[PDB]
């Protein structure tokens, strides 16, 4: 009743809001056997992974909330859809269709909604391409505060780390679920620093979907700073999330280059508390699936207005190899919204930036 991988687990702070878990079934789709137990186990270990990383970065034993209905069992919403599986494929807006339909279900059942974040899980298609040994066919990506992942018969934590085909399949699809969940929890892509790579392995939001459960995987300081401001990590029930717009005035921005150091400073002002500053440094190009290389850094602010100052060591920018690079400054607000300002430089014509 408790798998070995969960015998080592920490007590977590109760949260104000919980991630919804939906097991989403096409009108013609059969559940994968034993999914309540298998998925509860995988989700609780996932909750442990995020909570231990939050703790290791100084936030205490905080993870995303889950609605737990009895020991070791997540209260998973089993949703029978209006249409057959074919109507919600990986391609062509299948994920938007499922997610819009679940909105109707949550309007019709507000008691089942515990936050604005949902992980929708669909059983693998079984056809000439996909099946138990090669799952796929369904949405598998982040979509706003929602994210999509899949289930298949060997999707079972007992295979975690085993040097077998089931174990390798698990790291692929469990790492996959972990990464897409990161997106649903307001995480962008980021790459580990050089020192963090040697200490802790692969950033989950970089290439960690290939490593989770097999070699060391972790959450960066910047990832944890965003989770710190994510609705389902809240231990503060008075705090409302995602309403309105990010309002931050950033002024007196300076970025200067001195020897090996990158100096970043400025001031900020917001009607909300500004929790933190994340900095992303990356090579071009800069699109949303071309930023696995953005090496991130983070600093605690914690005021509605003030100054920020930060020295970044150039030698930590592991993997960057372009003459051209971009520094992004990300201001994270207490209600989970954020704003970004971007700056482009060239290493062979490095120009300090002012104003
Ligand atoms: C990214 O890695 C994932 C595992 O970590 C996974 O392989 C994903 O691939 C998609 O999986 C979907 C599951 O329904 C579909 O089968 C889809 O066709 C397939 O590409 C990987 N993404 C990409 C873009 O390859
Ligand atoms: Zn991604
Ligand atoms: Zn890039």
Residue numbers in the entry: 27 to 381
Lines from the paper:
OgpAWT comprises two domains from the N- to the C-terminus: (i) a catalytic domain (residues 25–262) followed by (ii) a β-sandwich domain (residues 263-385). Interestingly, a Zn2+ atom coordinates with the side chains of three histidine residues, H205, H209, and H215, a highly conserved triad among metalloproteases. A glutamate residue, E206, is well-positioned to act as a general base/acid during catalysis.
The strategy for capturing a native binary enzyme-product complex was to perform co-crystallization experiments with full-length wild-type OgpA in the presence of the GD O-glycopeptide substrate. It is worth noting that the enzyme was active against GD (“Methods” section). OgpAWT-GD-PRO crystallized in the tetragonal space group P 41 21 2 and diffracted to a maximum resolution of 2.34 Å. O-glycopeptide product was unambiguously identified in the electron density map. Specifically, in the OgpA-GD-PRO crystal structure, the O-glycan is found above α3 helix making interactions with residues of loops 4, 6, and 9, while in BT4244, ZmpB, and IMPa structures the equivalent loop 6 is shorter than in OgpA; also loops 4 and 6 are far from the O-glycan-binding site.
